Write a protein that binds this ligand. Structure first.
Ligand SMILES: *[C@@H]1O[C@H](CO)[C@@H](O[C@@H]2O[C@H](CO)[C@@H](O[C@@H]3O[C@H](CO)[C@@H](O)[C@H](O[C@H]4O[C@H](CO)[C@@H](O)[C@H](O)[C@@H]4O)[C@@H]3O)[C@H](O)[C@H]2NC(C)=O)[C@H](O)[C@H]1NC(C)=O
Ligand SMILES: *[C@@H]1O[C@H](CO)[C@@H](O[C@@H]2O[C@H](CO)[C@@H](O[C@@H]3O[C@H](CO)[C@@H](O)[C@H](O)[C@@H]3O)[C@H](O)[C@H]2NC(C)=O)[C@H](O)[C@H]1NC(C)=O
Ligand SMILES: *[C@@H]1O[C@H](CO)[C@@H](O[C@@H]2O[C@H](CO)[C@@H](O)[C@H](O)[C@H]2NC(C)=O)[C@H](O)[C@H]1NC(C)=O
Ligand SMILES: *[C@@H]1O[C@H](CO)[C@@H](O[C@@H]2O[C@H](CO)[C@@H](O)[C@H](O)[C@H]2NC(C)=O)[C@H](O)[C@H]1NC(C)=O
Ligand SMILES: *[C@@H]1O[C@H](CO)[C@@H](O[C@@H]2O[C@H](CO)[C@@H](O)[C@H](O)[C@H]2NC(C)=O)[C@H](O)[C@H]1NC(C)=O
Ligand SMILES: *[C@@H]1O[C@H](CO)[C@@H](O[C@@H]2O[C@H](CO)[C@@H](O)[C@H](O)[C@H]2NC(C)=O)[C@H](O)[C@H]1NC(C)=O
Ligand SMILES: *[C@@H]1O[C@H](CO)[C@@H](O[C@@H]2O[C@H](CO)[C@@H](O)[C@H](O)[C@H]2NC(C)=O)[C@H](O)[C@H]1NC(C)=O
Ligand SMILES: *[C@@H]1O[C@H](CO)[C@@H](O[C@@H]2O[C@H](CO)[C@@H](O)[C@H](O)[C@H]2NC(C)=O)[C@H](O)[C@H]1NC(C)=O
Ligand SMILES: *[C@@H]1O[C@H](CO)[C@@H](O[C@@H]2O[C@H](CO)[C@@H](O)[C@H](O)[C@H]2NC(C)=O)[C@H](O)[C@H]1NC(C)=O
Ligand SMILES: *[C@@H]1O[C@H](CO)[C@@H](O[C@@H]2O[C@H](CO)[C@@H](O)[C@H](O)[C@H]2NC(C)=O)[C@H](O)[C@H]1NC(C)=O
Ligand SMILES: *[C@@H]1O[C@H](CO)[C@@H](O[C@@H]2O[C@H](CO)[C@@H](O)[C@H](O)[C@H]2NC(C)=O)[C@H](O)[C@H]1NC(C)=O
Ligand SMILES: *[C@@H]1O[C@H](CO)[C@@H](O[C@@H]2O[C@H](CO)[C@@H](O)[C@H](O)[C@H]2NC(C)=O)[C@H](O)[C@H]1NC(C)=O
Ligand SMILES: *[C@@H]1O[C@H](CO)[C@@H](O[C@@H]2O[C@H](CO)[C@@H](O)[C@H](O)[C@H]2NC(C)=O)[C@H](O)[C@H]1NC(C)=O
Ligand SMILES: *[C@@H]1O[C@H](CO)[C@@H](O)[C@H](O)[C@H]1NC(C)=O
Ligand SMILES: *[C@@H]1O[C@H](CO)[C@@H](O)[C@H](O)[C@H]1NC(C)=O
Ligand SMILES: *[C@@H]1O[C@H](CO)[C@@H](O)[C@H](O)[C@H]1NC(C)=O
Ligand SMILES: *[C@@H]1O[C@H](CO)[C@@H](O)[C@H](O)[C@H]1NC(C)=O
Ligand SMILES: *[C@@H]1O[C@H](CO)[C@@H](O)[C@H](O)[C@H]1NC(C)=O
Ligand SMILES: *[C@@H]1O[C@H](CO)[C@@H](O)[C@H](O)[C@H]1NC(C)=O
Lengths: 449, 147, 40
């Protein structure tokens, strides 16, 4: 048939693409609100009306294990902290000798230590004795006795500004013009292959950036059942992402009361430290209910057995070593940094057939090094008053041991230190596409000479 | 009916050719969500550098969206049909490019799977478009003027 | 025994980790990069 090309512009076709998205946070007046590191000078106020245009007949292939949104969220998070902490004061004078001692007179199991050191007055030629109350994790020994901080060898401990506030605030990742984001709505999506229900979205829902290990706090829930999700299930070195359909609540506190000193450093730059224990010394702890935790493990075992076998025995162990960042459960709540001992949750067997809460003891330290960069460290100023937190547990990160024996007993352990498992468990249903408007098609049109 | 942006992605070539103005205005004028980059009145110092490091990453996606748009609008001016969202270019459809017959294309194929078959030949289909227009503009029109 | 020297061997104080304690350190500077004030 004798036909002639016609040219169409605006035709709805796609190619897969890679690009850099928009931070796009939510916004208010914030006239008295303290500058907040997660947003401010990075984000723009959010389209208040996302439109989820449901497509017909479209079947697209997604892959959550090769996504770039997870790979640039981990790069922005380092760049959001590293750009806020340029103006902040360095704590270089505090690398001195400390005349410290115990706080109590009768040791039961101590925690705090009471120190003494010199510090400059206003005029920088006069020296005075000042004290503070440092935790014992943040103090090491030189040789009555004389102590010093944990990192005077290599690191410059940058005091986090007091006008700052670190806090989960929902970031919406948006695409600029010429790009689009596609959302899966299939409820059985294990993470790869075709998604038979696709809808274009302007901007994703608001994920709350929380940096935790071994357990996923304030996450997004499943839809019908528990969703077990991993890459190459028979491979040991791959983590196993678990996602709940119902939240499991937690209650955390620091039950001792504290105030702040105001030991100055220089003209206009002070330093905060722990001053007094107004009350009684108590250990920080967290509660998980037991009847809800024993039923939430009744579902994770149930759908592990569809991947391994019905007649197998499924057991949970606790850990096998490492630093505090990967043997325990890390938080960021209320301005302090809790590292709770979770050897009481992950301890049971399963054999294929009211109000009593599980208490979790918990440590505190205030000189943290996040991402383990060489010669860098942070410092969290103390919070005046006791701290209270309430959170949900929506998900786990297990890992499988698997040596070469013949036994029918699998053992699953919680896993820690890689932040890309926190983000890959949230942006799994997305893909960015490119919009190519020109197209050609044969017809009977003939320009008319 | 307008279903919104990309709503006709699963429809036929016949039924999705009703919606061509949607993917054109949202190819540029979806930037109205980016003109918020003139931000609120900033405070004093302490992160004055963070204000401009994140200012370039907002502006590379503004400029890159503009200067990828003009080179696809200009290319329609080379073929002889600028402005029109539908033009006809008077180049014979060689039957080695594709297949069946005219009528199983517009009734039960989508543009996405159509684009797959003809993507292999797109640089030679774009080759004849700039040749059947050059023969008309410099030869025919200056001859039909004086004759 | 001088034939025509080039290097010089020096000594100075330098702070340890704790910035209130001073220790003796040395180095080997070229003679073009060292001038005289007034053992010596
Ligand atoms: C998981 O999500 C939960 C639910 O949102 C979240 O709990 C929230 O924690 C924040 C912690 O900042 C709470 O905010 C505080 O709430 C108390 C309630 O009395 C207020 O007093 C606080 O006001 C102070 O805020 C600053 C603290 O110094 C001061 O600058 C200020 O002047 C006030 O003194 C503050 O608003 C928030 O209320 C809860 N949410 C609920 C619903 O209770 C939890 O933190 C998340 N988990 C993790 C690990 O982040
Ligand atoms: C997540 O879901 C996807 C799809 O639901 C699973 O992909 C499926 O993987 C199995 C692996 O055995 C594929 O079966 C094999 O197919 C090949 C031919 O493609 C055949 O030679 C083999 O004998 C076997 O039948 C299956 O095709 C594939 N699904 C699709 C739609 O292609 C994936 O395994 C799931 N992930 C996990 C961890 O279970
Ligand atoms: C998916 O595309 C089809 C085109 O094949 C749409 O139209 C249907 O076409 C079949 C076969 O031509 C008819 O039997 C149906 O009656 C058509 N649908 C309607 C509503 O008339 C179809 O509509 C598209 N899918 C959806 C969900 O709209
Ligand atoms: C302050 O508390 C610490 C923590 O218990 C005490 O540390 C002891 O240090 C000695 C020194 O070698 C060790 O042998 C002990 O094992 C440590 N623990 C205990 C429980 O004795 C320290 O003794 C306390 N300070 C003073 C002055 O007694
Ligand atoms: C930590 O040690 C300091 C001194 O090293 C204690 O401060 C003293 O408290 C007594 C109260 O009986 C006062 O009479 C002294 O004048 C205080 N000394 C100074 C220099 O202020 C402080 O009480 C200790 N803290 C704890 C929790 O034991
Ligand atoms: C700074 O580093 C030195 C070297 O590691 C620490 O001193 C001790 O040095 C001996 C021999 O070099 C090691 O076997 C010890 O393990 C070191 N002790 C510790 C606690 O690491 C010194 O303590 C370090 N100082 C600080 C503040 O970390
Ligand atoms: C923690 O300690 C502070 C004091 O440092 C307590 O605040 C006092 O509370 C009483 C009772 O309401 C008031 O009479 C005082 O005026 C308060 N003092 C200050 C400086 O504000 C606070 O209540 C304590 N927190 C807890 C939970 O016991
Ligand atoms: C965590 O703390 C909350 C309180 O903030 C507890 O909620 C209360 O639970 C008791 C017992 O069921 C009820 O009588 C109260 O009415 C609840 N408070 C509210 C505001 O509804 C919750 O039980 C705690 N969770 C755990 C696991 O201990
Ligand atoms: C849970 O983990 C802890 C440490 O993380 C293990 O504790 C050790 O238990 C053995 C007894 O088999 C003791 O000899 C060790 O001293 C303990 N370690 C420490 C650091 O104290 C424990 O075995 C694990 N399992 C259970 C079921 O508690
Ligand atoms: C985490 O908690 C467990 C218990 O919940 C700790 O195990 C205890 O370890 C000490 C050290 O010898 C023993 O005296 C106790 O008998 C152990 N408890 C039980 C129930 O066996 C474990 O050590 C804690 N983790 C760390 C790192 O200390
Ligand atoms: C943490 O979990 C609780 C329990 O789901 C959430 O609180 C609400 O609980 C009621 C139960 O009566 C549900 O119907 C609501 O859907 C829950 N959400 C809201 C927004 O009301 C609580 O919101 C969870 N925390 C977060 C941060 O989402
Ligand atoms: C170290 O070497 C220098 C370089 O030769 C010697 O410098 C002499 O300094 C005296 C002082 O006035 C001059 O008069 C000489 O001309 C210099 N050169 C020579 C070759 O003598 C210096 O003497 C040497 N140090 C010592 C301690 O002898
Ligand atoms: C530079 O001078 C230093 C001392 O000023 C010399 O170092 C001494 O070398 C001897 C070797 O015989 C050692 O016994 C001493 O302990 C060293 N002193 C110190 C402080 O380490 C060094 O050898 C000189 N360099 C040259 C090239 O002559
Ligand atoms: C939880 O419940 C199951 C079934 O009722 C029971 O076998 C088990 O002992 C309980 N406790 C734990 C720690 O699994
Ligand atoms: C395991 O149990 C499931 C439950 O329905 C069943 O479909 C499957 O056939 C069982 N497999 C074996 C090997 O018994
Ligand atoms: C671990 O399990 C054993 C056996 O059920 C139990 O006796 C022990 O208390 C558990 N450990 C912790 C820390 O609760
Ligand atoms: C059609 O295409 C083939 C190969 O692309 C070419 O050899 C031929 O000259 C074209 N034109 C015809 C058959 O008119
Ligand atoms: C077009 O071609 C197909 C198969 O090559 C044939 O079945 C049909 O009769 C042809 N003619 C039409 C649709 O007019
Ligand atoms: C596309 O071109 C390649 C290279 O010649 C060829 O192998 C392939 O068959 C072509 N596909 C189509 C649909 O023409």
């Amino acid at each position: 048939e004798n036909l002639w090309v016609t040219v169409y512009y605006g035709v709805p076709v796609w190619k897969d693409a890679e690009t850099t998205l928009f931070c796009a946070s939510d916004a208010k007046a914030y006239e008295t609100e303290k500058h907040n590191i997660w947003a401010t000078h990075a984000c723009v106020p959010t389209d208040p009306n996302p439109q989820e245009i449901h497509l017909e007949n479209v079947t697209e292939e997604f892959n959550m294990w090769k996504n770039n949104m997870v790979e640039q969220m981990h790069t922005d998070i380092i760049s959001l902290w590293d750009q806020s902490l340029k103006p902040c004061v360095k704590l270089t004078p505090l690398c001195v000798t400390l005349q410290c001692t115990n706080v109590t007179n009768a040791i039961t199991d101590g925690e705090l230590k009471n120190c003494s050191f010199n510090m400059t007055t206003e005029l920088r030629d006069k020296k005075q004795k000042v004290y503070s109350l440092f935790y014992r994790l943040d103090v090491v020994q030189i040789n009555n006795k004389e102590y010093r901080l944990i990192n005077c060898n290599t690191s410059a401990i940058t005091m986090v500004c007091p006008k700052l506030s670190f806090e989960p605030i929902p970031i919406h990742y948006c695409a600029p013009a010429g790009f689009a984001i596609l959302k899966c709505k299939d409820k059985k999506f294990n993470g790869t292959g075709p998604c038979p229900s696709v809808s274009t979205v302007q901007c994703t829902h608001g994920i709350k950036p929380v940096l935790s290990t071994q357990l996923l706090l304030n996450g997004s829930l499943a839809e019908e059942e528990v969703m077990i999700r991993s890459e190459n299930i028979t491979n040991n070195a791959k983590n196993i992402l678990v996602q709940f359909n119902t939240p499991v609540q937690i209650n955390c506190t620091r039950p001792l009361n504290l105030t702040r000193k105001s030991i100055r450093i220089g003209p206009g730059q002070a330093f905060y430290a722990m001053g007094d224990i107004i009350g009684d010394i108590r250990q920080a702890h967290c509660n998980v209910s037991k009847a809800t935790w024993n039923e939430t493990l009744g579902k994770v075992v149930k759908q592990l057995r569809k991947h391994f076998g019905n007649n197998t025995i499924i057991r949970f162990a606790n850990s096998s070593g490492g630093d505090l960042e990967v043997t325990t459960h890390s938080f960021n709540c209320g301005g302090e940094f809790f590292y709770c001992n979770t050897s009481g949750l992950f301890n049971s067997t399963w054999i294929s057939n009211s109000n009593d809460s599980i208490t979790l003891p918990c440590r505190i330290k205030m000189i943290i090094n996040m991402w383990q960069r060489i010669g860098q460290a942070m410092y969290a100023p103390p919070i005046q008053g006791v701290i209270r937190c309430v959170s949900n547990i929506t998900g786990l990160i297990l890992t499988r041991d698997g040596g070469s024996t013949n036994s029918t007993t699998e053992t699953f352990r919680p896993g820690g230190g890689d932040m890309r498992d926190n983000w890959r468990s949230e942006l799994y249903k997305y893909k960015v596409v490119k919009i190519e408007p020109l197209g050609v098609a044969p017809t009977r049109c003939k320009r008319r000479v | 009916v307008f279903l919104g942006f990309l709503g006709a992605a699963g429809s036929t070539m016949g039924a999705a050719s009703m919606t061509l103005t949607v993917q054109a205005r949202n190819l540029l004028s979806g930037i109205v969500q980016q003109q918020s980059n003139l931000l609120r009145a900033p405070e004093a110092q302490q992160h004055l550098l963070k204000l401009t490091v994140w200012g370039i990453k907002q502006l590379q996606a503004r400029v890159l969206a503009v200067e990828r748009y003009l080179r696809d609008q200009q290319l329609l001016g080379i073929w002889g049909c600028s402005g029109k969202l539908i033009c006809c270019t008077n180049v014979p459809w060689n039957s080695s490019w594709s297949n069946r017959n005219l009528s199983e294309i517009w009734d039960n194929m989508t543009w996405l799977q159509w684009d797959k078959e003809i993507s292999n030949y797109t640089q030679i289909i774009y080759g004849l478009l700039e040749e059947s227009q050059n023969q008309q503009e410099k030869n025919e029109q200056d001859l039909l003027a004086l004759d």
